[PDB]
Amino acid sequence: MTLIKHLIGGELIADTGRTADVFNPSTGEAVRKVPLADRETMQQAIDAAKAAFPAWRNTPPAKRAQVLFRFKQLLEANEERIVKLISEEHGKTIEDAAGELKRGIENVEYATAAPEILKGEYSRNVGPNIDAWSDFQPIGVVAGITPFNFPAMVPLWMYPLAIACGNTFILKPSERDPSSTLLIAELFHEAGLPKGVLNVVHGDKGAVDALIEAPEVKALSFVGSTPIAEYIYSEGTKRGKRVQALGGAKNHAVLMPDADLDNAVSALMGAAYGCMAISVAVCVGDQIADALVQKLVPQIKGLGAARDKVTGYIDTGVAQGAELVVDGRGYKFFLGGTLFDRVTPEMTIYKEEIFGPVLCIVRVNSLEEAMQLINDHEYGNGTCIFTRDGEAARLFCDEIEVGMVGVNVPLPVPVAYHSFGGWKRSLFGDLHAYGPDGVRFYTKRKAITQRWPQRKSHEAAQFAF
Amino acid sequence: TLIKHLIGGELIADTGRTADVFNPSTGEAVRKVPLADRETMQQAIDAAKAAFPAWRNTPPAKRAQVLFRFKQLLEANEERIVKLISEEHGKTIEDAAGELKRGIENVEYATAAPEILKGEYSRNVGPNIDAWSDFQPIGVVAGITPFNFPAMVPLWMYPLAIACGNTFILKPSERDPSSTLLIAELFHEAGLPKGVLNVVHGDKGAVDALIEAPEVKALSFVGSTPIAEYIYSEGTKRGKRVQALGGAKNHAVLMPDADLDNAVSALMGAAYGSERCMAISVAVCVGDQIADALVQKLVPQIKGLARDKVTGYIDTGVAQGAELVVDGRGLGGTLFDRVTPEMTIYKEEIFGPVLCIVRVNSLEEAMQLINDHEYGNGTCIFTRDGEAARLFCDEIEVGMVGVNVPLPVPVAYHSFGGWKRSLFGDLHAYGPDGVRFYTKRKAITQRWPQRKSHEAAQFAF
């Protein structure tokens, strides 16, 4: 543990040039250094992947499935070692880190069976001496840009599927916890993956701009924050690339007047403080809002530049006219449960996401207004409605635009993301249900019609030297 | 006479801005068309927004039913329709009837879309928690259609979108809008509720209206590449789903070993006026021999059967050093040799019977040429070599490929964005892409939290 190496062309490269430091969130002490890569160091990876592609594309489906199956085993073998490397640079419960990797492995298990659903049809003499067939081909060299949370699972949600489909991959992970990701890359090479099929290149905005600029890379896949997502989406798409982009968002719960309050409070307390991501509670009518606050407050007492970040957030909230009902700042400098009431979508505390236990209550007069509020912003990947009315619930499920909906029940969607464009993937849905969307993003359909026009005779004079 | 809009189930007469529809075989104006303002569009939008909730909840089988009668009423009125196509677009009635036969195949596919749209139900997936999954319509959607194909391109959009349970605003071409409107009316005659399909005639104003309207959730366009890029970028910028096909150029590759009579036959089928007929506008020849030979054969056969725009096009071609081998100024029938991708005649898309030969030294160069531009929807390679053909099929990026055989792709289009649909593919193969464009997937989990007692005091009056 001194300097972390790139994984280009099957060998580990040491870059010395620009460099940042990876810290240990639970200690504070910088542990290692990471190389912010130049366009030359990226072009290496691109050339490596471009070179590996034709061989890999023609590798038999069953052989690709085989190398993935061993990759799954070698991950289930080295779990302890990996999980340690996650908790060390990200700082999270080893139990959480292990649960993340279990998900990554589910993604690898799904990828092993992608070759099966990718077989196409053949027809001899669809017309006179004309054969026809259809295939699903890989698109070429593709790249994935991964976030800080989930250095294990988010890459394993991208590249195994893309490689199973027969592409080659350049992975540019987060600078802040890149060791765990790189280990998993190496294990894939150890499982049997040819050189150049997966490459790992560490870096920052430079590295990413490199991939956005490179005309060889055909598809670009990103999960992180909403500004960076919009960037990569628009700038990628305008250069003919396929772009899949999940950007951070806010999930909303709606409370109708008839909501069973103990049930809603249970969901909100698990989601905002206590598993689902919810950051805004839209209340229809003032009664249910006043009542919700009455119940929330007791239960929330029941439980350096970042210090200035949160104080700034809260302070702006008060400044713009929100009611700060529970201020979670305290000692043991932690941020406990914070509750804001009387929040509006023009406030900064609604528009800006803040890390940690913060709920905003937004008061609204009708269900239509609540649904319009949720639909008109960068809507997330989960939403709830709490009500006893059947007609309300049916309408909410019909007109809300969020993909997963919970009626009096929270959803297994632990982080909120908005999905850009038409190349849409779900991160937290059932893999078997949303996997085809991944497969379609990493493949192109091809439809061939073929005829070999005839000769009258086939004497040696009709061929070459 | 004057052509009426079809908003909210009734025919409206607009008088305001107006253009003239000509009878383009016999270049002489036959009718007038109303270029609509934002108010006349907002009428349609409001009509469609109103019709949506009822239509969305109409049973699958009832939607299938109205589509099935729509198919019959088209097969009933074919003669009348085809006449109206040939009259304002100007094309052989046999072609116009073949177009409508395709439109009807689109309607037949839409009738069966309700079946593939059923989802799952599971009682107690968790303790007293039900779960289900559904494919819902998205709302009010709009389609903007081109001059070529006033019958089939709309029937490729709205029947499927309506079968999925949306409502539709159709803004057809100003230049041949009679035939499209007739088919709209027949749909109403088949039983379609008022407001579910609306037809609003217009131009850039009308289109900008739909691009601006926040009620319309998806926008579907087929036409020229500049207008396509416009609608794509500006539509996606406003949160809409946009499906866009923009005019392009299909390329044929000739290897040295190509059977020339076979290639010439395919290239010569690719005809322009005013089951496998193909659009090809560029013939990439590998090596000079096959190119010289191709020219030798093409010239005699080019005695076949906007005008001011393309004198400029041809003139620029000569100016930049292309060899003008057959000059079609007058009936058309133009051939250019020694064309390069830096010329304007390669970059700009051209009205009419124009073929450009591009000489290249390797197959790799030919494939790179085709791949590096806004590639079309069809391509051919002519060769006897198996390895060449396999490689071409592997590395070319065009979706449909013909090896020594032309493809049934009569117009070239490039597809923008991630909402991609094929216009000329097998409907059963590319139909799901349409279905996905006009629907949104939902996963619902539901629980009704219990009460301890259910006396009348626990409910409302």
Ligand SMILES: Nc1ncnc2c1ncn2[C@@H]1O[C@H](COP(=O)(O)OP(=O)(O)O)[C@@H](O)[C@H]1O
């Ligand atoms: N300004 C930027 N432009 C382009 N890419 C960036 C930028 N900032 C960060 N990235 C890259 O995107 C990922 C981080 O995006 P971000 O939204 O900051 O995720 P997170 O903050 O959750 O780690 C990293 O992989 C990083 O390399």
